[PDB]
Design a protein around this ligand. Structure first.
Ligand code: SRM
Ligand code: SF4
Ligand code: NA
Length: 469
């Protein structure tokens, strides 16, 4: 397995052509796997190719640079298209500022655990901020960014039956002018580095450090170290976490074509040459591609005149095959056969599972609707099921824990509803549950909120204390 450092998921067509080639020739699987952290992975690199892979990444200006700072995410397709550039420039700066000097920031012993950061452009939460340690929520005025609201402490990983572990959402620290960004970023990393419990790795994460010392205590140290005082949180709202599948207008005569790629797995399948179609678009595309946090790919900045050009290839290659709004809002992790920590299938199970969910949605007359549904192959939480309305957490081969209760924007953790059950048992529950939502839901009420309001599942109000029954 090889993964790239790709801030904000922006990758050029030239770099793309380089990855399509290597993946095709130098890997067992021969596929490109877009991750939900806006980057790519190769699966099955032969040890002889471990050298040419780094060279290949480098020749195109890429790198794979662990208990370090992971890919810094950034909202991929904002409604106010102009805001992307400075947000993306900031995600890129934070990423570079947090890189190891090989360690004034990381420390010699580095970090207790992996540190995850994001730049969010409301009203979109496609990057799923509550799954991350440090979050920069962009505040704009007159089309220019002016500062960031800082949310710290997100994390989703749990351990089966271990009430000492839990998923936690990020806490609000305050508003910081744009100039204090790197200082604040640096301060959060260092206090976590110092305060973070290093002995027990399962308790090293920031979400744990925050619960032990307290948000306000953590906050004061961040202000002390940063040389600033946080200002009050400035109003921000989210409306969803999905991608804008299809064409959307960008700035000027620019357009963006977000392609839905199931499981982010790019490979040529019989009659659906996804991998070649993307190579073909890469060769004629004026611009970049953007890897979304929903494992999809955006063909960004297509001049209005080139729309038909690109659409012809995407269409012919099966890259624009129509899916239901449900499939578009469902996610799973890689899991088998490559993940060594896998307990239950995820990526290889999602497709057929969703076929089943689509039938249920149809059967209840809600086929134009969607439920944020995610399947994670083990509790480490890579598929982000702990921020979904319906989350399936793998417990053993063919058995998952069923969580319900999250919401569409992902600001609530789903409590466990049923435990260690199989697919036919999972579907029987959802058949009934969807049946009720379809008939009892209020105007525009999501499935998650319904289960909570209808007394179907108690909400998780304070993860550290009431996540576990
Ligand atoms: C590809 C991806 C899932 C996907 O289908 O997209 C992935 C895949 C794996 N993750 Fe992850 N993680 C991915 C996002 C995350 C997320 C979600 C997120 O960040 O948005 C989480 C949950 C949030 C969180 O971090 O709390 C996540 C929590 C973990 C953990 C639990 C860590 C912890 O703090 O307890 C592990 C295992 C570990 O680190 O000990 C892990 C471990 C793994 C490894 C690398 C397995 C391993 O340790 O050997 C998996 C690779 C399997 C494979 O063959 O691909 N992965 N993983 C994501 C790649 C991210 C990236 O490109 O940087
Ligand atoms: S959630 Fe578990 S099975 Fe799935 S990719 Fe992460 S470590 Fe592997
Ligand atoms: Na996808």
């Amino acid at each position: 397995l090889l993964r790239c450092r790709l801030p904000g998921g922006v990758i050029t067509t030239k770099q793309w052509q380089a990855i399509d080639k290597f993946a095709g020739e130098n890997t067992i699987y021969g596929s490109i796997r877009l991750t939900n952290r806006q980057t790519f992975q190769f699966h099955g690199i032969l040890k002889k190719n471990v050298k040419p892979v780094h060279q290949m990444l480098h020749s195109v200006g890429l790198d794979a640079l662990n208990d370090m700072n992971r890919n810094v995410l950034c909202t991929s397709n904002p409604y106010e298209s102009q805001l992307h550039a400075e947000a993306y420039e900031w995600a890129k700066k934070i990423s570079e500022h947090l890189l190891p000097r090989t360690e004034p920031i990381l420390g010699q012993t580095y970090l207790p655990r992996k540190f995850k950061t994001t730049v969010v452009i409301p009203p979109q939460n496609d990057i799923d901020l509550h799954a991350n340690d440090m979050n920069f929520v962009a505040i704009a005025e007159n089309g220019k960014l002016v500062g960031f609201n800082l949310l710290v402490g997100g994390g989703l990983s749990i351990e089966h039956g271990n009430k000492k572990t839990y998923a936690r959402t990020a806490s609000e620290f305050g508003y910081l002018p744009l100039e204090h960004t790197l200082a604040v970023a640096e301060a959060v990393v260092t206090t976590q580095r110092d305060w973070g419990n290093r002995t027990d790795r399962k308790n090293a994460k920031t979400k744990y450090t925050l619960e032990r010392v307290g948000v306000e205590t953590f906050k004061a140290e961040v202000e002390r170290r940063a040389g600033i005082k946080f200002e009050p949180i400035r109003p921000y709202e989210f409306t969803g976490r999905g991608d804008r599948i299809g064409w959307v207008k960008g700035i000027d005569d620019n357009w963006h074509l977000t392609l839905f790629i199931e499981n982010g797995r790019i490979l040529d399948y019989p009659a659906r040459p996804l991998k070649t179609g993307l190579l073909e678009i890469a060769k004629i595309h004026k611009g970049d591609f953007r890897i979304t946090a929903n494992q999809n790919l955006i063909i960004a900045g297509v001049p209005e005149s080139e729309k038909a050009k690109i659409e012809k290839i995407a269409k012919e290659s099966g890259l624009m095959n129509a899916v239901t709004p449900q499939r578009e809002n469902s996610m799973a992790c890689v899991s088998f056969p490559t993940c060594p920590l896998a307990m239950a299938e995820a990526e290889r199970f999602l497709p057929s599972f969703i076929d089943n969910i689509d039938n249920l949605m149809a059967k209840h007359g809600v086929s134009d609707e969607h439920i944020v549904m995610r399947v994670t192959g083990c509790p480490n939480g890579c598929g982000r099921a702990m921020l979904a309305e319906v989350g399936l957490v793998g417990k053993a081969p063919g058995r998952y824990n069923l969580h319900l209760g999250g919401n569409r924007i992902g600001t609530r953790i789903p409590r466990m509803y049923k435990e260690n059950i199989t697919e036919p048992e999972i579907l029987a529950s959802l058949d009934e549950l969807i049946g009720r939502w379809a008939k009892e839901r209020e105007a525009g009420e999501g499935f998650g909120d319904f289960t909570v309001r209808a007394g179907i599942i108690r909400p998780v109000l304070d993860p550290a204390r009431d996540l576990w029954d």
